[model samples]
Target: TKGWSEVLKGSECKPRPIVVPVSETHPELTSQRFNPPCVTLMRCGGCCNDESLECVPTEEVNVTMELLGASGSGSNGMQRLSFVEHKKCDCRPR
Candidate 1:
């Protein structure tokens, strides 16, 4: 069911903590990694009105994550990546 909303200025808009898997977190790469350390991400996941607007990230923290070769079942050779860490969210124009 699509539970939507609007701000009277009340909103379901905010950053939420989520676990990001290694495969989804990394940029497009051919290198293999598994069961690596995960970073906590405060991402946007909120309901909004059906017709007028939507939620989007307004600010973020630049991040670089490094993984250990001994972390798990894969070889992490110089494994590191730059990803966006969520900071703020706003209900804005579509």
Candidate 2:
């Protein structure tokens, strides 16, 4: 019970707040930190019980993220990236 992941009978995709560093998220950018030094995004993700069914966003919103350069970098200063935020999620046929 403690050594395995929970098995779901159906899709459990939904919006949940997740805190993570910016540098590890995007490989193309060299962001040492975000506007707040870190970001909490309410992204949707979960396991799909059916192999043919994939979890995806049904509707959406938007967000603008601001980032700062790394400790050793100079040119990367302030960068802004717009992203689509998911408002709803569900299982859809692949």
Candidate 3:
């Protein structure tokens, strides 16, 4: 299955909604009800604190995308590509 990193690689760094196609061939992702997935961009404390940071550390943002059921919209089984951006802090206990 494709992850957020792979999806974001060729995508613009912006927040927007999109519709993804569900292939009947992918059994693991497709189902009788729905095929859901999401893509988000998150920031770590280090990146948030450092204003001059050019690149975000990979170790600090290693997230994989997965099926999260369905979107919030009440559409008829439409797969929504949701994008969310947030920051994470290391002060919190893991």
Candidate 4:
């Protein structure tokens, strides 16, 4: 059996494209939105409670997520994922 693309190419005689019913493709795609809470462990510089070094809870960090597609068209166009921080955190021991 030939591939779909190849079959389409050879066909001067075309059949009307049969659009599949929506019910067949259950769960339509939609944008998901949620206020995801951020949490991280930050280093403390022996300031709180006179500790030499410690980790603390750093919450609500400003961050953004990006879905980066392939670098260029030469490759298979794999999806690349990355994150960006809106602001830098000063985690120095106070």
Candidate 5:
């Protein structure tokens, strides 16, 4: 349900892989499997002007969708009704 953690006393050494748990992956993420639910594989809509350098955004993006199933039943058997487009960017040049 929750995430694991590793405790370290102060030292000049660094641990390998750094012991990150599932909750640490997305700390603000909920326990639900399909968060912001509508996960679709899109092949269009984003524009990339430059071909040489890669385009990578460094900002937070939030996409919200309505919960279509009964509360507390979890998202196992839930269906996606619709999706709302939400994206933010801190453009960077490589």
Candidate 6:
């Protein structure tokens, strides 16, 4: 068995950190190098869009919106979807 430290306890994964919203922008998030083609569609949900949008670093802290479940009122049923924000470190090539 693995050690306890290796295990992710429920309590350890549910906390949100309080962060101050830094105004202005970070070159790292706006430069073309940071945007990858794989996530062109994924950018739609982010609070800021376009290279022109002035965003606070905190507001731009990366939003990982996962569409866990989808439903149709009529009986078509629902579907589940998931995705993570900047899932990978910005350093890696797409």
User: What are the TM-scores, per candidate, against the unseen true structure?
Assistant: 0.61, 0.53, 0.19, 0.19, 0.25, 0.17
Checking candidate 5 for backbone clashes, the offending pairs are none
Model 2 clashing-pair count: 0
Tens-place lDDT digits, model 2, residues 35-94: 655677777788577889887888888788876654444444677766567789887898
Per-candidate RMSD vs. true structure?
5.3, 5.1, 13.3, 26.0, 15.3, 17.0
For candidate 3, what is the lDDT? 0.37
Candidate 3 per-residue lDDT over residues 1-94, each given as its tens digit: 8898776554433223334333332346443344443233554323222344333323332333444355346334444333333332332221
lDDT by residue for model 6 over 1-94, one digit each (tens)?
Answer: 8666555332232223332211112223222221121222222122222445432222122443222121233233222223323222111111
lDDT of 1 by residue, 15-73 (tens): 88778876676645435554365667788768566648787888888777776434345
Model 6 scores a TM of 0.17
Ten contiguous residues with the weakest lDDT in model 6: 85-94
What Cα-based lDDT does every candidate model obtain? 0.67, 0.67, 0.37, 0.29, 0.34, 0.27
Please tell me which predicted candidate would have the highest TM-score against the true structure: 1
lDDT by residue for model 4 over 2-86, one digit each (tens)? 9978865554222222232222222231222112212222222122333453323343233333322222333333222223222
Give per-candidate clash totals: 0, 0, 0, 0, 0, 0
- lDDT measured at residue 62 in model 2 versus the true structure, 0 to 100: 78
Question: lDDT value for candidate 1?
Answer: 0.67
Clashing pairs in 6: none
